[PDB]
């Protein structure tokens, strides 16, 4: 209605929770206003409602609240965000308020931030391959339009620079796929949770240098911001991305800075509500909560738009068995894992090929899409690199002087691979150049040992010298 | 040389890791026992003492 | 004010009933003695108060009075050359009032109300003033203290006191709306002080240590963490940074550490010399002390008090360096307080909001543009104490996600008396690429190339050390023996530094540049001599090796003459053979 | 156990100002007291030694003894995996110094040695090495204390 009733009678304030006794009229999940005695207004959300009392979680801090003067009033029954096409180029905080000094958005529509599940009948297969300009991604872990491909990082590894380079260099190849029509540039939606000033300044400068701010929508939640506000940021970002993609036929790329901060924020509410913990104190419903965020990307039958997600997360002790990467790997369609050992040797980007995986690679490669010899070359490179890595552990024990010629060839191939294929710097390699380098590296091995490659492709591409590419 | 290296290097390295993993698992078991105690105490209170 | 009585006492936790109307995070007076407390939970008619002092001897029924204000510190002249309690109480007055033992209930003003200060006005009547503006100056120990408008005050000037001598509590500027401004103001310790903008750090923070200034630099306004087990050398490194850095004001926070280490600073510092101003070293240092045998709840307040003082000195245009002795004691205090609240614990019993507090504490650093218009910066170095050296503990992992530099210590190097014992393989720094334009014009154009060459030599030595211990040193070729010997020379002569030697305790950038040049020149000459058939034993027995080893003990004034002769000595020594 | 990371000695280490560690290896071969100089540490030693208290050559002698014993331990532990084929004359000198050190300086038994005779024994052990090897000691203290023979034989 046009007026709202103020609910006095708060009886308990502790941590992020607040109890109100005479609030049977509040709907479950509703958004409320918490008015301080000095006039300050804070936000909140109802998480449990009964005829006896209601439980409200508070977004902002609880400093200055008292049980005598504080009052609660309802805003809306369902949390909604006003979205419009004119919000491109704007900046917002973690709760959708402008921070760029411009007047607020006139909403065309209001959409629930929780979203709705996509009908599996209404989906379609991702088919368009994306050329990111990185050989270790284009050749062995191919990314297609509509894929969820998180990046597994560490404390000192440069995941943000890799994500910025990918967003700078991403493009599809209509000439290879036969489409012909020139693609439009990607629209970038950027969501930050608990980001520091050091990373935020780098991201802002990189986006300003390339001129991508005219096509970007930014949702920022800094490290000094309240922790509970991190729950709503990915949902708002994904609501905007889905609206733009499926209502105006945009091609949207979504980047999430750190899901570890989101999980840490969720653990506070989980521990405050005495929920049954997981393996390391995380709530047992964390798999369901993460699934509602990741599964909002994809493509829709009969529509041109698409949503692509590149989440970033940090494994704490470089641990793949930590609950957050473990639950992330069961939902997404692959992962890109960085290696600290390659980082210590000056190799950039330090992408580890063996732990990396792309589940949707087979849809976007083959004859008529990239080339006829993609998958076989990728498999042969994987097997040869695995053989070299296995031989390294043998020479670490028995010494390299007792090796045969075949083990020495594999050992040299591993070093040449690490020095030439993975290490590329800031250059933008095409798919053809990367395949040429891959065939040049495979030429070091004997021709008869290429078991996974058909002889038809061997007779066409074998025999290239590496010195004709790098001097 | 190989016998001396195996006797004086690898075996204590494995043994220390075994001890560390055992200590971590014991700590996790104690921590979950504490939570079970707390939830049993919560169960016993709301079902009998409230009017 | 709101007044109630005690109804529950349990350790440092006091529950007071009849406190309806009290607000969260306010300051209360507990008991008839008047102990300071803070409200952290409201429940109906009762309030939960944590006590910053000892609660033994209290009886149920004693009155509790709420002051209605959060925890705040007094910011103004007179904080330099002082030693303070965890809740900002001067210890030199506590000793006068109570003797050699610290007793609860002592109330002392933070700033001296009796000292006279020379006042020089800057504003005039009819002027318009905003938050952070300067309205006067007050002399200090070589500094010019600026009296600032509080950040939340706006108005017009009505009258100005003339030049003269006044105390801190005498009003000097009266606004037209009736607001009277004194020489000091109070600010809550849990609120970050406002700034205009934040800037990218591009100037180095010179620590005086070779391994930290060269291999793993930290920029002015960055953050760093130094973990390690007991006896590794955290406190010595922090005190050397306090002694030899180029920061204008140094704030030292001792949270839950030994009292002898704090007495060492109180004794040694007044007799030392300021590196840049020429006065006593204690005139630029502020100490906050909370030893391990002091009450636990005061550990949390000391960190906030120190960071608030550092933020206040930042707003005056100075460059401030903040050192925290141990954040693990702060984590232990948070764990104890949460255990008294019977909250659900996270991993290792810590509260789930541990990472948010650390993120909010390290976020206060950075180079900013002040509200007045000047430029200031705050750099934070915080030591972490993992229990068994296990750096998978939650505090270390939460710290590593926000800091820009990581100085990892090793217990293996500390047992063999190799100091500063920095593990150069596990350490990293994210500020190296931004300081290169500064290095290329302030030291030399080829300095990053020499640094990269030294790093490559160390990596090659670390690689060859596996073959050295798995096949024996006799099986190595002469080229690998040269690399092993040069790595040993580097480790013994460049990375190693003595913090107690009268000369080696401080090292300029150009001295380290000269040492690196000498080492690389020797390596190049020895590499050239190998192709000529010279035996490796002939190279190693050369007397010029001792000249490089003794180079770090030469004073700064005599070093260029040493280097100029040493280069010719190396060239002639390698020319005279074969 | 050998667990230096057990909570009790770990929490003792973070509060105190050093530690003295007994070695089981020295106890097995009969050395009493079995104090191992390598993991031991005294953080306040630098304030209590120098001119006016004890003797003015205390710190230099202590540093030289630590350096020579560390070199002897390195030489001794090099052999235990590869073999004794790589020793030179200087390595054998340091090995003999380490043997005599553990025989006499540490293995004092139930005696009541004063600081003066302890320094005398230390200087007697330092006389087994050439003056060019004593890098840590200033040559003034060498000129007036070098040349003592093994008093405990
Ligand atoms: N740079 C150095 N130069 C010389 N000696 C050093 C150096 N660093 C450490 N030491 C020696 O090692 C000791 C380590 O003591 P220190 O107080 O620095 O350790 P810490 O890491 O702070 O340990 P704790 O956790 O026990 O407080 C010093 O007292 C000193 O004897
Ligand atoms: Mg210490």
From Swiss-Prot, chain A:
The record's InterPro entries line, in alphabetical order, gives:
ATP-synt_VA_C, ATPase_a/bsu_AS, ATPase_F1/V1/A1_a/bsu_N, ATPase_F1/V1/A1_a/bsu_nucl-bd, P-loop_NTPase, V-ATPase_su_B/beta
Keyword hit for Transport: yes
Q: Which GO terms describe its molecular function?
A: ATP binding; proton-transporting ATP synthase activity, rotational mechanism
Record carries keyword Ion transport: yes
Q: Which HAMAP family match?
A: ATP_synth_B_arch
Which keywords fit this entry according to its UniProt record? ATP synthesis, Hydrogen ion transport, Ion transport, Transport
Share an example GO biological-process annotation for this protein: proton motive force-driven plasma membrane ATP synthesis
Check the UniProt entry and state the signal peptide residues, or none: none
Q: Name the SUPFAM superfamilies for this protein.
A: C-terminal domain of alpha and beta subunits of F1 ATP synthase, P-loop containing nucleoside triphosphate hydrolases
What is the organism field in this record? Thermus thermophilus (strain ATCC 27634 / DSM 579 / HB8)
Which cysteines are cross-linked by disulfides?
none
For this chain, the family text in UniProt reads:
Belongs to the ATPase alpha/beta chains family.
Spell out the protein name for this chain: V-type ATP synthase beta chain
Q: What does this protein do?
A: Produces ATP from ADP in the presence of a proton gradient across the membrane. The V-type beta chain is a regulatory subunit.
Q: Which domain of life is it from?
A: Bacteria
UniProtKB/Swiss-Prot annotation, chain B:
Q: GO biological process: what's one of them?
A: proton motive force-driven plasma membrane ATP synthesis
**GO molecular function, one example?**
ATP binding
Keyword Ribonucleoprotein part of the UniProt annotation: no
Q: Which UniProt keywords apply?
A: ATP synthesis, Hydrogen ion transport, Ion transport, Transport
Highest taxon above the source species: Bacteria
Family from the record: Belongs to the V-ATPase D subunit family.
Q: What does this protein do?
A: Produces ATP from ADP in the presence of a proton gradient across the membrane.
Q: What is this protein called?
A: V-type ATP synthase subunit D
Swiss-Prot record, chain C:
Which UniProt key words apply to this protein? ATP synthesis, ATP-binding, Hydrogen ion transport, Ion transport, Nucleotide-binding, Translocase, Transport
Q: In the record, what terms sit under GO molecular function?
A: ATP binding; proton-transporting ATP synthase activity, rotational mechanism; proton-transporting ATPase activity, rotational mechanism
Q: Does the keyword Chloroplast apply?
A: no
Report if keyword Ion transport is assigned: yes
Q: Its Gene Ontology biological processes?
A: proton motive force-driven plasma membrane ATP synthesis
What reaction does this catalyse? ATP + H2O + 4 H(+)(in) = ADP + phosphate + 5 H(+)(out)
Q: Which residues are connected by disulfide bridges in this protein?
A: none
One GO cellular component term: proton-transporting ATP synthase complex
Might you give the EC number(s) for this enzyme? 7.1.2.2
Enzyme class name? translocase
Where is ATP bound in this sequence?
Answer: 228-235
Entry's Gene3D superfamilies? 2.40.30.20, 2.40.50.100, Bovine Mitochondrial F1-atpase, Atp Synthase Beta Chain, Chain D, domain 3 (1.10.1140.10), P-loop containing nucleotide triphosphate hydrolases (3.40.50.300)
Q: Which CDD domains does the UniProt entry name for this protein?
A: ATP-synt_V_A-type_alpha_C, ATP-synt_V_A-type_alpha_N, V_A-ATPase_A
Domain of life per record? Bacteria
**What is the documented function of this protein?**
Produces ATP from ADP in the presence of a proton gradient across the membrane. The V-type alpha chain is a catalytic subunit.
The Swiss-Prot or TrEMBL record describes its family as follows: Belongs to the ATPase alpha/beta chains family.
Which NCBIfam families did the record assign? PRK04192.1 (NF003220)
Name of the protein this chain belongs to: V-type ATP synthase alpha chain
């Amino acid at each position: 209605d046009l007026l709202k009733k103020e609910y006095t009678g708060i009886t308990y304030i502790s941590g992020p929770l607040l109890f109100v006794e005479n609030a049977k009229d509040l709907a479950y999940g509703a958004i409320v206003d918490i008015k301080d005695g000095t006039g300050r207004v804070r936000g909140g959300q109802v998480i449990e409602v009964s005829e006896e009392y209601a439980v409200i979680q508070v977004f902002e801090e609880t400093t200055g609240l008292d049980l005598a003067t504080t009052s609660v009033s309802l805003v809306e029954d369902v949390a909604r965000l006003g979205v419009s096409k004119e919000m491109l180029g704007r900046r917002f905080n973690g709760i959708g308020k402008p921070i760029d000094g411009l007047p607020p958005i006139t909403p065309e529509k209001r959409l629930p931030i929780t979203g709705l599940p996509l009908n599996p009948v209404a989906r379609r297969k991702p088919e368009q391959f994306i050329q990111t300009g990185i050989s270790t991604i284009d050749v062995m872990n191919t990314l297609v339009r509509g894929q969820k491909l998180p990046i597994f990082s560490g404390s000192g590894l440069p995941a943000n620079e890799i994500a910025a380079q990918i967003a700078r260099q991403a493009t599809v190849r209509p000439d290879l796929s036969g489409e012909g029509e020139k693609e439009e540039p990607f629209a970038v939606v950027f969501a930050a949770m608990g980001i520091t000033q050091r990373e935020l300044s780098y991201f802002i400068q990189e986006f300003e240098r390339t001129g991508a701010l005219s096509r970007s929508v930014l949702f920022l939640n800094k490290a000094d911001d309240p922790t509970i506000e991190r729950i709503l940021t990915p949902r708002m970002a994904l609501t905007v991305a889905e609206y733009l993609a499926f209502e105006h036929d945009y091609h949207v790329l979504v980047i999430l800075t750190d899901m570890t901060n989101y999980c840490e924020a969720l653990r506070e509410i989980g521990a405050a509500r005495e929920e049954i913990p997981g393996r390391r104190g995380y709530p047992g419903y964390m798999y369901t909560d993460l699934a509602t965020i990741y599964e909002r990307a994809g493509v829709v039958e009969g529509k041109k738009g698409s949503v692509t997600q590149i989440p970033i997360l940090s494994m704490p002790d470089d641990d793949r068995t930590h609950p957050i990467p473990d639950l992330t790997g069961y939902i997404t369609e692959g992962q890109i894992q960085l290696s600290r050992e390659l980082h210590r040797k000056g190799i950039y980007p330090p992408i580890d090929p063996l732990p990396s995986l792309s589940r949707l690679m087979n849809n976007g490669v083959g004859k008529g899409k990239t080339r006829e010899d993609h998958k076989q070359v990728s498999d042969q490179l994987y097997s040869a690199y695995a053989n070299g890595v296995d031989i390294r552990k043998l020479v670490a024990i028995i010494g390299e002087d007792a090796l045969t010629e075949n083990d020495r060839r594999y050992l040299q191939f591993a070093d040449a691979f690490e020095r030439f294929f993975i290490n590329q710097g800031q250059q933008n390699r095409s798919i053809e150049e990367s395949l040429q380098i891959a065939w040049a590296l495979l030429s070091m091995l004997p021709q008869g040992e290429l078991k996974r490659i058909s002889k038809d492709h061997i007779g066409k591409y074998y025999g290239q010298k590496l010195e004709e590419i790098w001097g | 040389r190989r016998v001396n290296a195996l006797e004086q290097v690898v075996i204590p390295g494995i043994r220390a890791q075994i001890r560390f993993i055992q200590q971590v698992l014991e700590q996790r078991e104690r921590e979950d026992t504490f939570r079970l105690k707390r939830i049993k105490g919560k169960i016993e209170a709301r079902e009998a003492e409230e009017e | 004010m709101i007044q109630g009585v005690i109804q529950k006492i349990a350790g440092p936790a006091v529950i007071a009933k009849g406190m309806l109307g009290a607000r969260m995070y306010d300051i209360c007076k507990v008991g008839e003695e008047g102990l300071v407390g803070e409200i952290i939970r409201l429940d109906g008619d009762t309030a939960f108060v944590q006590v910053y002092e000892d609660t033994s001897g209290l009886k149920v029924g004693e009155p509790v009075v709420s002051t209605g204000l959060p925890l705040a510190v007094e910011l103004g002249p007179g904080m330099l050359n002082g030693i303070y309690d965890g809740i900002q109480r001067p210890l030199e007055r506590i000793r006068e009032k109570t003797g050699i033992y610290i007793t609860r209930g002592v109330v002392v003003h933070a700033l001296d109300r009796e000292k006279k200060w020379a006042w020089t006005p800057m504003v005039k009547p009819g002027d318009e003033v905003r938050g952070g503006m300067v309205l006067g100056t007050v002399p200090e120990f070589g500094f010019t203290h600026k009296i600032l408008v509080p950040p939340d005050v706006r108005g017009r000037v009505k009258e100005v006191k003339p030049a003269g001598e006044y105390t801190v509590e005498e009003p000097v500027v009266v606004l037209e709306d009736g607001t009277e401004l004194k020489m000091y103001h109070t600010w809550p310790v849990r609120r970050a002080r406002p700034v205009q903008r934040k800037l990218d750090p591009n100037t180095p923070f010179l620590t005086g240590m070779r391994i930290l200034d060269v291999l793993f630099p930290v920029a002015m306004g960055g953050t760093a963490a130094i973990p390690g087990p007991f006896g590794s050398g955290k406190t010595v490194t922090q005190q050397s940074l306090a002694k030899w850095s180029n920061a204008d004001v140094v704030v030292y926070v001792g949270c839950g550490e030994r009292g002898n280490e704090m007495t060492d600073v109180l004794v040694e510092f007044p007799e030392l010399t300021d590196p840049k101003t020429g006065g006593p070293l204690m005139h630029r240092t502020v100490l906050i002390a909370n030893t391990s045998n002091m009450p636990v709840a005061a550990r949390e307040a000391s960190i906030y008090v120190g960071v608030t003082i550092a933020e206040y000195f930042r707003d005056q245009g100075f460059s401030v360096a903040l050192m925290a002795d141990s954040t693990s004691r702060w984590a232990e205090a948070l764990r104890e307080i949460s255990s008294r609240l019977e909250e659900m614990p996270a991993e290792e019993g810590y509260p789930p909001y541990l990472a948010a507090r650390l993120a909010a504490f390290y976020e206060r650093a950075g180079k900013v543009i002040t509200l007045g218009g000047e430029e200031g910066a705050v750099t934070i170095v915080g030591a972490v104490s993992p229990p068994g050296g296990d750096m998978s503990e939650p505090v270390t992992q939460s710290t590593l996600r926000i800091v820009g530099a990581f100085w990892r210590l090793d217990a293996s190097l500390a047992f063999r008396r190799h100091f500063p014992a920095i593990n150069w393989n596990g350490s990293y720094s994210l500020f190296t690429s931004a300081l290169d334009p500064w290095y290329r014009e302030n030291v030399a154009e080829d300095y990053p190339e020499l640094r990269d060459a030294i790093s490559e030599l160390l990596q090659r030595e670390a690689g060859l050390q596996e073959i050295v211990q798995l096949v024996g040193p006799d099986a190595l070729q002469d080229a690998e023996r040269l690399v092993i010997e040069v790595g040993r020379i580097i480790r013994e002569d460049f990375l190693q530094q003595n913090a107690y030697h009268e000369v080696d305790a401080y090292c300029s950038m150009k001295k380290a540049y000269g040492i690196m040049k000498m080492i690389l020149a020797f390596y190049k000459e020895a590499e050239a001599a190998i192709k000529r058939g010279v035996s490796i034993d002939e190279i190693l027995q050369l007397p010029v090796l001792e000249r490089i080893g003794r180079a770090r003990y030469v004073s700064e004034e005599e070093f260029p003459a040493y280097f100029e002769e040493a280069m010719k000595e190396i060239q002639g020594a390698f020319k005279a053979l074969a």
